[model samples]
Target: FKPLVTAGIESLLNTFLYRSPALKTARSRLLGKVLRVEVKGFSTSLILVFSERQVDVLGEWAGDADCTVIAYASVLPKLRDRQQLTALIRSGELEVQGDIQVVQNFVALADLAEFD
Candidate 1:
């Protein structure tokens, strides 16, 4: 993963964890669940792991995960827009797998910050 993207995602996670109401609830209830975020790009794929209070760039991995969230770099623009997030996935800008309900529970957190 590009260091810039990793930095951006880490910042996003921290901002969301600190400010989003829904995410705080998730943190309290499902704090230890490990989440894998996979982002496919033109020439590379970035994988990120999030668990309780930590986030790691896994490089690569195998097997099932608790949840998987996917999004393009473009979706960063809408993080603070509060629009229907599924639209990004449906429109082909974002893709996800595993437990979607778990993914849904964190939308408010992901949408809590502007990219800047």
Candidate 2:
């Protein structure tokens, strides 16, 4: 169950990144980084491991993440607007730990995902 969930997430994200030119540059910034995401009530917290060309969503990880986003599922979709990152954090709707730049860059992947 966990593998498929991770796989499904990995597929969706990677597919978009592959098709997105704007999101491509942000991928380079995230190379070798990991972003941990934990929604308030989800059974699985996600570890997004960034490689040269794709983002892998892992179900389990032991090492430290470059950035961690702990928030409600309802709030995560708002990451489409990069500016909302800091805003949400300030509003106490989101919690991010570690390098803010990592969060900024990673969230930019979603921010840049506009297609023709």
Candidate 3:
């Protein structure tokens, strides 16, 4: 039930990353890191496992995460502006733990893609 939708998100995300020319360097910083995101509207957490190429969005993970992000739906959309993340955190609309840099970098990569 969970992995089905998650797999679709993973596929589309990888597709976007694969077509980009500027992300390899930005992506390199995230390699080997695992990020778990708990969204306000979702029941299950979404996991992002970073690699040299693309990010894998999974419904679950057995290992520990390098970063954990809890964001409300209202603030989640603010990710379109990576700079808003810091403000959102300070404003209490988003909460992040562990390596905050991981979330920041990940948002930068994701912001490059269209939400469509």
Alpha carbon lDDT of each predicted model:
0.58, 0.84, 0.82
* Number of clashing residue pairs, candidate 3: 0
1-116 in candidate 3: lDDT tens per residue?
78788989789778876467766887787899999989988788889898886788988788889999997767666775676788988987889989999989878877765553
lDDT tens readout by residue for model 1, 48-102: 4556664554444675567776776667555444456677768877677777655
Span of 10 residues, lowest total lDDT, candidate 3: 107-116
TM-score for each candidate, following the candidate numbering: 0.58, 0.90, 0.86
Candidate 1 pairs with clashing backbones: none
Pick the winner on TM-score between candidates 1 and 2.
2
- Candidate 1: 10-residue stretch with minimal lDDT: 107-116
Best by TM-score: 2
TM-score comparison, 2 vs 3, better candidate: 2
Deviation from native of the Cα of residue 51 in model 1, angstroms: 3.8
Please tell me which model should have the higher lDDT, number 1 or number 2.
2
Candidate 1 global CA lDDT score: 0.58
> Lowest summed-lDDT stretch of 10 residues in model 2?
107-116
lDDT of 2 at 10: 94
